[PDB]
C-alpha cells in the first residue's frame, strides 16, 4: 500500500478487543485510547468522530501514527477520547489523499454511517465470569432424577381439573388421553443435578448452570409460579437448593461454578395465593375478593374473569408493578426478603437471574417495551448489583435487545436468538429455529453476525447467551435432519464465537426434538459420554475456549466468506494469541488457504489445529488446511 488517493479497505480494522482499545469498560475517570489498523503507509490522516451524550454534539479527535505490527504489513494509528461519566458513540474517518472511507461497528463504508457506532459507556460493567464462561442450561424435570422419593406420580394431584401423569425415563413427552402436556413429569430434580455436576463441570467443562424455573408451581415447566420463596417439592426443598449451590460454587469438584436462576417476574401462576383462582389457600386472593390484600397486584378488566395476562393465557395473570416504591416492586426486587434479593443474599448467594418475558414487565396491565418497563429494569439492576455487583442479569428477548442493554443501566446481556441462534440455524440447517425453510449463504451469515454484534456494546456482546436450541424452539439436531456433522460444525462455531456459549442440555450429544413440549425430552445418560463424537468434541472445544482468552474477549475479524465452497473463516485474537477458525459448511471436503497474515501471524511460525491436533507452518502469510464437509479447524498460536 501507499499514499495513492485510495484507502484500502482490506487493511482497515478496529473493534474493542485488547489490541485496539485500552479501556473497554472504563469508569468516569479513565480515558479511552483507540487504535485503528491500516496497511502500512496506506493513508494520510484519520480522525475519531464521537457523539457525546453530555452535550448532544459531535467531537473531533485527530489520530497519529503509533506503530507497525510485528510483520510490518500494517500501521496502527491512535487517538484518545477523554474521560467523563457520559455515554459516547464513535466512528472513524479515514483519508488517503482524495480518498475517504468511514469505519464503525458495521465495518468500512464509502459514505458516513448514521448507525452502528462503537459504544463507550462509563461505569457499565458486566460480570467477567459471564464473559469468560460456558453455560449449561437445564430443564429440571428432564435432566436427572436423583431422588425418586419426591417424584410426581400419575394422579398425585390435579390442576384445573387435570391429573398429573408420570412417564418412564426416556419415553415420549406427550400426555396421554385424559392428561395434559404441561402436567407430564419424568422425575428430574435438584439432587439429580447435584449428583451430575461431575459431568457438567468435568466431562464437559461448563462452569455456569442456568436452570429453568425451580420454585413451587403446578406445571412441569413452572413458569406459573405459586410460591417464589420455596423450591417446588418435586425438585426438592430450599436446603437441597442450598446444597446444590455449595457444590456448584465448590472448586474441589472442578472449576468454580456459577448458578443462574430463571426469574419469572412478569406474571405469576393463577394458583399463586396472591391470585388464588382455585382457592387453594385460606387467604383471599385477588381473583377471590376485591378486598384482597393483594388485589392491586393484578389488573382486572372485568373482575374476576377478565384480567391482564401473559399473551392472553389466563393461567398466567400479569403483575401490576405500579409506580416506584410499590408493594409489587418491593416483593419482587426492592425488599431484602424479595424474590430477587433473597436468593442473591446468603444462605443462597446465587450468581444471576435470567429474566423471563422481560420486555412485558409493566404497570397497569400494559404491554411493556416502554418507559415504565425500562424504569423497572433500571431499579432492578440497582437492587441486584447493590447486593452483588457480580450477579448477572440476562433478559429474555428474541430481537435486538439494544433498548435494555445499550445504556448500561439495565441488563448485562440477553438471550441471543437474533444474533446467534437464528443465523446459525439458517446457515447450517437451512431452517429457521422454528424448523421452517430459511437458508442463508456464508456472505449473508457473516453480514448477519456483524450487524447483530453491532447492536450491542462490546461487554454486552461478550456476555450474550448463545445457545443452539432452547426450551421454546425446535432442537438443532431436528432442524439438521439428524446429520450429526451439522452439530459438529455448530459446536465449533459456538465455542469460538463472541458471547457465552450456552449448551441446552442434550444438544451436546445431538438430542432431537420438535416444538414444545418435544424440545424438552428426558436426557439419555448412555449417550452422554466421550463415546458420542459430539460429546467428545464439546469437551475438547470447551477446553480450547478456556485455554485462550482471545476466544472469549478477543477481537473478531472476518477472514474468508466463500459462497462457492461454503467456507467461512474468522480470527479471534489479542495481545497474546492469534486464532484462525476455518469452517466448511459444504457437504464435501475443501482445502483452504487461510490468510493468517491478516491476524499478523509471522511467516515461519507454527499453528496447531486444536480440532485434530495436527500442526502447520505459516508460509507466505498462509496456512493450507483440508477441512471435511460440515466441520472445522481452529488454527491457534
Ligand atoms: Ca493508499
Ligand atoms: Ca425425583
Ligand atoms: Ca382462597
Curated annotation (Swiss-Prot):
Q: What class of enzyme is it?
A: hydrolase
Question: What organism does the UniProt record list as the source?
Answer: Thermoactinomyces vulgaris
The record's comment on cofactor binding reads: Binds 3 Ca(2+) ions per subunit.
Record EC number: 3.2.1.135
Annotated InterPro entries = Glyco_hydro_13_cat_dom (IPR006047), Glyco_hydro_13_lg-like_dom (IPR004185), Glyco_hydro_b (IPR013780), Glycoside_hydrolase_SF (IPR017853), Ig-like_fold (IPR013783), Ig_E-set (IPR014756)
Q: What is this protein called?
A: Neopullulanase 1
PANTHER family, A to Z: ALPHA-AMYLASE FAMILY MEMBER (PTHR10357), MALTODEXTRIN GLUCOSIDASE (PTHR10357:SF210)
Q: Which residues bind Ca(2+) 2?
A: 145, 147, 150-151, 187, 189
Q: Which UniProt keywords apply?
A: Calcium, Carbohydrate metabolism, Chloride, Glycosidase, Hydrolase, Metal-binding, Secreted, Signal
UniProt: Ca(2+) 3 binding residues: 276, 280-281, 283, 288
Catalysis: reaction(s): Hydrolysis of pullulan to panose (6-alpha-D-glucosylmaltose)
> Where does the record place it?
Secreted
**UniProt record similarity statement:** Belongs to the glycosyl hydrolase 13 family.
The primary gene name is: tvaI
- Work out whether the entry's keyword set contains Calcium: yes
- Purpose of the protein: Endohydrolysis of 1,4-alpha-glucosidic linkages in pullulan to form panose. Also hydrolyzes cyclodextrins.
Q: Where is this site: Transition state stabilizer?
A: 472
Give the required cofactors.
Ca(2+)
A GO BP annotation: carbohydrate metabolic process
One of the record's GO molecular function terms: neopullulanase activity
Q: Which Gene3D superfamilies match?
A: Glycosidases, Golgi alpha-mannosidase II, Immunoglobulins
The UniProt record gives the binding positions of substrate as 267, 354, 471-472, 516, 520
Active site (UniProt): 356, 396
- Got a GO cellular component term for this one? extracellular region
Quick one: which residues bind Ca(2+) 1?
2, 4, 6, 42, 96
Which is a Pfam family this sequence falls into? Alpha-amylase
